[PDB]
Structure 1
Amino acid sequence: FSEAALEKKLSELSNSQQSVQTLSLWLIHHRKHSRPIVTVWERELRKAKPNRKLTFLYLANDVIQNSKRKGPEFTKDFAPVIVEAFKHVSSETDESCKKHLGRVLSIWEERSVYENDVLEQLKQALYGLEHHHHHH
């Protein structure tokens, strides 16, 4: 595992099934490094252009869900950053992009991906009144 390799892969990440699936497999293989991986993922997410940010969440979705079979590493290590990540993506993208964020969150609530406390925080992050403080 190297952070440099991860950075390179994240920079060339796209929405294709092959792009997300292969990166997910690599990350899960390297689950011993889940904390540094999440740290790098969060940093590159914030650096990404709005039209690319959703792709980071799709990756996280795939990694978190598929990792559960192997261990709790990714579920646990995404947990402290994932609310802020949804809030970030929600704020930096067009209102209609909530279609995609909401789909993921719906998936997570339907498949029990995180517990209640977290799921509700995610709900607030996505739909909450804090997005509506300023005239537009």
Structure 2
Amino acid sequence: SAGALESSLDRKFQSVTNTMESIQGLSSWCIENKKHHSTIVYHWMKWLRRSAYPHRLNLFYLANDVIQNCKRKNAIIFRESFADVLPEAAALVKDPSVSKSVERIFKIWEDRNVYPEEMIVALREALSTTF
């Protein structure tokens, strides 16, 4: 389990790209495997730390897709699970090559109340798009 799941997550998080098909395929897999939410987020963050900015952005696209869709898919636990890593993660995507795309994601969450105001403020400060 722990080993099988680690092997899948490594393969999937290494390879996620910027296509709708890549993102939605992996998002669906994550939501199917909601039982393992905490392990999923742990490996997502591991991959975010070890990646360079372009691949960090694709991992943020995956996170956004999961966070958005997990509610209608009866897997709202992912919102709480990702909140564990988002403040640290925001600071790893401050570079202007990617921060505007992440800032957009945070604005979408804010407008829809996906996370509360005070959490989004803390994330935008970490991104350096609000001071």
Per the normalisation by structure 1, the TM-score is 0.86
Mapped pair 1:67 → 2:81? no
- Bigger Rg, which one: 1
Judging by fraction of residues, say which structure has more helix: 1
Structure 1: gaps (5+ residues) = 130-136
Q: Distance in 2 between matches of 1:31 and 1:86?
A: 23
2:120 aligned partner, one-letter code: L
Q: Report the Cα offset of residue 96 of structure 1.
A: 4.6
Paired residue for 1:123?
Answer: 124
The Cα offsets for residues 72-122 of structure 1, whole Å up to 9 and x where unpaired, read as 2100111111111011121xx3x2532211111111111211012211111
Coordinate RMSD, CA, aligned? 1.4
Specify which of 51, 55, 60 is matched with residue 52 of structure 1.
55
Cα distance in 1 for partners of 2:100, 2:117 equals: 21
Give the structure 1 partner of residue 93 of structure 2.
89
Q: Secondary structure at the match of 1:68?
A: coil
% identical aligned pairs:
38
Q: Which runs of 4+ in 1 moved over 3 A?
A: none
What is the aligned length? 126
The answer for the alignment partner of 1:5 in structure 2 is 8
